[PDB]
């Protein structure tokens, strides 16, 4: 067959092989400078775990020399190894997001807690907010102590930090939140009896490179997206059934899914990938889980017709809204909600054809999720025309910004990477048929050329969290390129 199909085949063999007999595709997170610096600060202040702190120090020095992260994380590493506002401004340069103002407070207070800048002169209520709740409480506590006002801290602020004193892996698999909470709790005499045992668990988490990852992994997200990709192949492999089983038995009591095992917070992104996969691979076997996932999404839907990531009443997001439209459109009884969601997507498209950056740092992610909803959900007459025009503008944005090598990067003038390109390919597969030399043909040839001899892909990461900071789950590169090749063939 074609070079593209041969590439798809070699990549599918690799993804199938990576899935274990438990049905899960392992998806560890790489070490990150921010959490490595906070773990170094915490263990240094407590005079604990000297072997670990020596490895953390070496990891930070190596990473800064050879693969420096964004300027905020660099300033954080420099603060612990030893200006701040320039790093904060550069690290949040054009951060167009509804969280930007809270993020500025959060990131400035992290730098202040490490001695790199002064604490924000804000009313304490500015810290008041489940997502980022523990982090912001820990930072409020660090600001009260760091400015010399420890009496400000209320018992209800400490109470929010208690999960950080639990043994074992971090609550909600989130090392950033546990580390910030422990940096706060170590100032409280009443919480110190629990600190010593948790510092042993923290030090135990260091990766072979000496660093601390942001999260324990992302196996639910990664298994669901891989299952979806495999289920779009002409003859899906037998392993989609144990993958579907492994996901369904991890659903939370609200019917949704978190990003890893042991994450009790469901979110719309994970739940949409799980639902799209189950609908294709196991709609009867897991009929009840499907219904529970639809019910979860419907219960989050905001009054503007959009969907948030975690909780009704927080801002709707374009990509989550498009994802939910596509996942709910499988049921004809949900047509009203699906059409209101697609109408939200059209209404929020930008004048240049783009949508947003949120959980991914490239523009092409939300473009693909929007284009799948705009072209996959049933529509006729004037509404079909409206959605077609919107999809055309999004695909035209892709063509206008395609790099000479056929790929896309995180922004119009960045070097190409396989994940940003994979998202563009999924979108372009809903446009005109590929023609020699056209945008989709060239994008596919870019992906063919970037395949490694081992059958996989190595890519700069795109995932952000807390937004806009990048973290690296390398198993996603193969998965999203396979999803692209399955859509495009």
UniProtKB/Swiss-Prot annotation:
Its cofactor is Mg(2+); Ni(2+); Co(2+). It catalyses: (2E,6E)-farnesyl diphosphate = (5S,9S,10S)-drim-7-en-11-yl diphosphate. It holds the Pfam family SQHop_cyclase_C. Mg(2+) 2 binds at residue 135. Its EC number is 5.4.99.-. The keyword Repeat applies. It comes from the Bacteria. GO terms for molecular function: isomerase activity; metal ion binding. InterPro entries: SQ_cyclase_C (IPR032696), Terpenoid_cyclase/PrenylTrfase (IPR008930). SUPFAM superfamilies: Terpenoid cyclases/Protein prenyltransferases. Mg(2+) 1 binds at residue 135. It is an enzyme of class 5 (isomerase). This is Drimenyl diphosphate synthase. It comes from Streptomyces showdoensis.
């Amino acid at each position: 067959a074609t070079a593209v199909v041969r590439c798809r085949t070699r990549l599918a063999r690799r993804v199938v092989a990576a899935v274990g007999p438990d049905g899960l595709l392992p998806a560890p997170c790489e070490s990150r400078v921010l959490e490595s610096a906070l773990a170094l600060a915490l263990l240094t202040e407590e005079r604990a775990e000297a072997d670990a702190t020596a490895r953390l120090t070496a990891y930070l020095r190596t990473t800064l020399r050879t693969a420096p992260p964004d300027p905020f994380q660099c300033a954080v590493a420099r603060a612990v190894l030893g200006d701040a506002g320039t790093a904060l401004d550069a690290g949040l340069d054009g951060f167009d997001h509804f969280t930007a103002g809270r993020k500025r407070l959060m990131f400035r207070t992290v730098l202040a807690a490490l001695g790199a800048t002064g604490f924000p002169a804000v009313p304490w209520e500015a810290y008041d907010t489940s997502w980022l709740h523990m982090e912001m409480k820990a930072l409020k506590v660090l600001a009260a102590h760091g400015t010399g006002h420890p009496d400000v801290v209320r018992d209800e602020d400490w109470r929010a930090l208690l999960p950080a004193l639990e043994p074992g892996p971090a609550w909600e698999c989130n090392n950033l939140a546990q580390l910030l909470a422990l940096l706060a709790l170590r100032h409280s005499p009443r919480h110190r009896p629990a600190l010593g045992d948790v510092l042993k668990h923290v030090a135990g988490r260091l990766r072979p490179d000496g660093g601390m990852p942001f999260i324990d992994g992302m196996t639910v997200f990664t298994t669901a997206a891989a299952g979806l990709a495999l289920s779009l192949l002409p003859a899906p492999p037998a392993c989609v059934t144990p993958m579907a089983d492994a996901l369904a038995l991890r659903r939370n009591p609200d019917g949704g899914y978190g990003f890893h095992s042991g994450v009790a917070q469901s979110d719309v992104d994970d739940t949409c990938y799980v639902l799209e996969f189950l609908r294709r691979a196991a709609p009867d076997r897991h009929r009840t889980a499907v219904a529970e996932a639809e019910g979860y999404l419907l219960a989050l839907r905001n009054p503007d017709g959009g969907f948030p990531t975690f909780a009704r009443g927080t801002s709707s997001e374009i990509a989550m809204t498009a994802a939910a439209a596509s996942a709910l459109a499988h049921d004809p009884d949900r047509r009203e909600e699906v059409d209101e969601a697609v109408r939200y997507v059209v209404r929020h498209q930008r004048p240049d054809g783009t949508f947003e950056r949120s959980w991914s740092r490239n523009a092409t992610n939300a473009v693909f999720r929007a284009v799948l909803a705009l072209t996959g959900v049933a529509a006729h007459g004037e509404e079909r025309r409206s959605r077609a025009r919107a999809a055309e503008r999004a695909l035209a944005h892709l063509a206008a910004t395609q790099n000479g090598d056929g790929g896309w990067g995180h922004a119009e003038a960045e070097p190409s990477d396989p994940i940003s390109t994979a998202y563009a390919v999924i979108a372009l597969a809903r446009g005109p048929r590929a023609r020699p030399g056209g945008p989709l043909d060239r994008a596919l040839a870019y992906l063919v050329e970037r395949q490694h001899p081992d059958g996989g892909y190595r890519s700069r990461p795109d995932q952000a969290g807390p937004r806009p900071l990048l973290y690296d789950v390398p198993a996603l590169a193969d998965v999203f390129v396979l999803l692209a090749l399955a859509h495009a063939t």
